[PDB]
Design a protein around this nucleic acid. Structure first.
Ligand SMILES: [Mg+2]
Ligand SMILES: [Mg+2]
Ligand SMILES: [Mg+2]
Ligand SMILES: [Mg+2]
Ligand SMILES: [Mg+2]
Ligand SMILES: [Mg+2]
Ligand SMILES: [Mg+2]
Ligand SMILES: [Mg+2]
Ligand SMILES: [Mg+2]
Ligand SMILES: [Mg+2]
Ligand SMILES: [Mg+2]
Ligand SMILES: [Mg+2]
Ligand SMILES: [Mg+2]
Ligand SMILES: [Mg+2]
Ligand SMILES: [Mg+2]
Ligand SMILES: [Mg+2]
Ligand SMILES: [Mg+2]
Ligand SMILES: [Mg+2]
Ligand SMILES: [Zn+2]
Lengths: 46, 173, 123, 38, 136
RNA sequence: CCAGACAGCCAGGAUGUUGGCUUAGAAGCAGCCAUCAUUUAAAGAAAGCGUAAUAGCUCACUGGUCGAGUCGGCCUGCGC
RNA sequence: UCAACGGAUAAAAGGUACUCCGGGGAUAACAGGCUGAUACCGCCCAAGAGUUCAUAUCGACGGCGGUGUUUGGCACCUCGAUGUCGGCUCAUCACAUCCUGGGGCUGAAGUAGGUCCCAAGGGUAUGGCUGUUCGCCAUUUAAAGUGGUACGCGAGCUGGG
RNA sequence: CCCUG
RNA sequence: CGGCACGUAGCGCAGCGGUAGCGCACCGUCAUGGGGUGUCGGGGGUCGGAGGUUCAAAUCCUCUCGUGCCGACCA
């Protein structure tokens, strides 16, 4: 178990919201299999 | 408001992990968003008590009549001087208001320092703030701290968290 | 006769070169320090890799004086400079590991046997 | 000895006494009660 | 800290305190603290004495306060020349003559009432004494 | 108060009972409530010291010895 | 609204540290004097803190005094002049004692203390800053006392303010 | 005028 | 310390014996794929607090506690 390095530095109001506004709890992008972000240049096995 | 509200709701301090097919995205790509619930009790704003004559050190000196008043709070060690007025009583009254202002300022700084220390500890625990995980794509609710799971996402998001809060409160997390 | 604001040379390899006596310990309104008396000094020059740097305040013992020591026979022992050996503030032993130049005899006390031993010649 | 301007018995073994025009109370029970009119 | 809720006039003359007081009889209760000397009583003195009585007796019996500070006292603030108007109102007093039954109490044993009156008299600035209800 | 007083001096100062609760322990003695009964010379669910709490040391109280005054409140003069 | 209301003219604001005269201690500024609100120093009551315990040490709510000692009040002396801050030189007195001396109590094991009583014989820093008294800082010392003396001392010095 | 990575 | 200026809706501001007003803002509907801008239609104020006169007080008066300004000078 290792400490997380938050990018807010010295937190003096609220660290939970600080870790939200840190990149750790960021919203994450999913690569669609088909649809909008659909095109794959090369396959997983090709 | 109500009795035992902070005790009932104190396990909710932390982060919720939404995984769902986002409607706001044009392609229907699913999104993994986060939110925090932070609960803190309504502490009593105590009155700021006045300072004691023995706790103060009162000196008078010549202004640059010795109407200049230097009030020194001894147990903490903070001084305020005032020399602008011919009245030593006016100088002393302004010095006493300066005393009260600095005492209030120092109490606020002490409170903010204690809050910053608590934040240092809870930023140290860090990733442990991610307490709850709702996978609406696969329709499962998970408390990682107690590790408990359920499938009734509509009931959970309706507000039937009694089982989860009881599990967390018996866990002591 | 060493008093306040008096520049002294350093008689050991502690790392300092020139010091200033800024206080004469051991009495109220005490003016002078003879040889073998503790003083409080500050350091004005230093060897760059010396064991003590410039601007530090620490004790020292006077080992040479241009006025010099009077012997009970009637002699005097005059040197050509004023020098001191630096000591720690709380423990009072020499900081350096050897002493340059001759010292005089009345330093022979239980505090300064190491000074008398490390000196090249004792007059 | 405690020097007060109003000396009196504090406990039941305390005795008033007047020595040299000075009222003291003496205590065979607790030396804390030893006190003097002054 | 006693004070009239409203008054006809804000300032009042100095006046004199001659004569001997009436209300020299225990009226409602039985055991009374009655003034012997002559002087003024600050409402703060009244409050401190009443607190000493009630917290010495520890809320048995009943306490009557037979005096009220109706007279405003002015004080000119410091470093101010004489004149240029009467000073501002500072506190309220009650003029008390000799023989004024100051405090009165009932429902309490005699020794406890005497002790509570001793604490009250220690807080008062004037001579007082203990009096007992007489049937006439 | 010569149906022996006050102060000394010799003795007791117990039983239910460690009255319960809340405490951590609560035993007269940390706080709260009640503040009885028996033996009756008298013993308070305790006035104080004390124990980690007990223990232990006194007191109120009453018995015995002695044999003339005792005790503390009020008014008041002069004093500290 | 000659309202400055017994109405100066029908018609009039300022600066002077460039100033000048007549006067005033009738009237201010320094100092003295009277007082003592305030200030400082004592004491009375004792809620409470002190593990129990008011009084080892503190002491709320209130009260009673002392000193003349700060800030004040007055305007009695001086306006045909009583030179004011600070430093230096030289002091002297008080005791409400900073050290040394004697002692009581302690929540005093010893060391080191805390508080109080008695005691004025002697002693009681040097420097950085600033005109500084003061204060802060560095380093000592047994200690770096508090006040009075025209806020001691300019027919003794300085003149930074 | 703009279109969450 | 002495005057004199103001306490009006969430905010900024008018009104100073009988009537509470304007703008931004909030809500609801349109317009847009959606947001903004835009359009339509609403509401919201012990008038700083207290008490005095008057038939009546936001307006008149007193005190009060806030904030601002101007002077706290010769020695
Ligand atoms: Mg007398
Ligand atoms: Mg006229
Ligand atoms: Mg002239
Ligand atoms: Mg005159
Ligand atoms: Mg004068
Ligand atoms: Mg004179
Ligand atoms: Mg004066
Ligand atoms: Mg006159
Ligand atoms: Mg003359
Ligand atoms: Mg003395
Ligand atoms: Mg002698
Ligand atoms: Mg002078
Ligand atoms: Mg002087
Ligand atoms: Mg001078
Ligand atoms: Mg002269
Ligand atoms: Mg000049
Ligand atoms: Mg944008
Ligand atoms: Mg000027
Ligand atoms: Zn005693």
């Amino acid at each position: 178990m290792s400490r997380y390095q938050h990018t807010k530095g010295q937190i003096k109001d609220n660290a939970i919201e600080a870790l939200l506004h840190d990149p750790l709890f960021r919203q994450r992008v999913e690569k669609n299999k088909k649809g909008k972000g659909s095109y794959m240049r090369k396959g997983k096995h090709g | 408001s109500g009795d035992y509200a902070y005790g009932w709701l104190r396990t909710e301090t932390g982060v919720h992990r939404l995984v769902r097919k986002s409607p706001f995205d044009s392609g229907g790509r699913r999104h993994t968003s986060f939110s925090s619930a932070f609960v803190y009790p309504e502490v009593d704003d105590d009155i700021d008590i006045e300072i004691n004559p023995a706790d103060l050190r009162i000196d008078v000196y010549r202004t640059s009549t010795e109407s200049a008043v230097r009030i020194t709070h001894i147990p903490t060690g903070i001084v305020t001087q005032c020399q602008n007025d011919r009245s030593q009583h006016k100088n002393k009254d302004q010095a006493m208001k300066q005393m009260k202002a600095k005492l209030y300022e120092l109490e606020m700084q002490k409170k903010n320092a204690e809050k910053q220390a608590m934040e240092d500890n809870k930023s140290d625990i860090g990733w442990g703030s991610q307490i709850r995980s709702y996978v609406l794509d696969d329709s499962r609710i998970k408390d990682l701290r107690t590790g408990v799971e359920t499938r009734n996402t509509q009931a959970v998001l309706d507000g039937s968290l009694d089982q989860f809060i009881e599990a967390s409160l018996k866990a002591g997390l | 006769m060493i008093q306040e604001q008096t520049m002294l040379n350093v008689a050991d390899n502690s790392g300092a070169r020139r010091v200033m006596c800024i206080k004469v310990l051991g009495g109220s309104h005490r003016r002078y320090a003879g040889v073998g008396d503790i003083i409080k000094i500050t350091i004005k020059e230093a060897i760059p890799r010396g064991k003590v740097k410039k601007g530090d305040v620490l004790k020292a013992v006077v080992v040479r004086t241009k006025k010099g020591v009077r012997r009970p026979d009637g002699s005097v022992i005059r040197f050509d400079g004023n020098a001191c050996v630096l000591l720690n503030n709380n423990s009072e032993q020499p900081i350096g590991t050897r002493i340059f130049g001759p010292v005089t005899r009345e330093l022979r006390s239980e505090k300064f046997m190491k000074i008398i031993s490390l000196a090249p010649e004792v007059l | 000895m405690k020097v007060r301007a109003s000396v009196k018995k504090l406990c039941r073994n305390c005795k008033i006494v007047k020595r040299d025009g000075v009222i003291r109370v003496i205590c065979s029970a607790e030396p804390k009660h030893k006190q003097r009119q002054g | 800290m006693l004070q009239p809720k409203r008054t006809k006039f804000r300032k009042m003359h100095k006046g004199r305190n001659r004569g001997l007081a009436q209300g020299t009889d225990v009226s409602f209760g039985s055991f009374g603290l009655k003034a012997v000397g002559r002087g003024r009583l600050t409402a703060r003195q009244i409050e401190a004495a009443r607190r000493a009585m009630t917290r010495a007796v520890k809320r048995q019996g009943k306490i009557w306060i037979r005096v009220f500070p109706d007279k405003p006292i002015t004080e000119k603030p410091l470093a101010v020349r004489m004149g240029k108007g009467k000073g501002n109102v500072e506190y309220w007093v009650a003029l008390i003559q000799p023989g004024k039954v100051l405090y009165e109490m009932d429902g309490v044993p005699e020794e406890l009432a005497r002790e509570a009156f001793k604490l009250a008299a220690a807080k008062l600035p004037i001579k007082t004494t203990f009096v007992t209800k007489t049937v006439m």
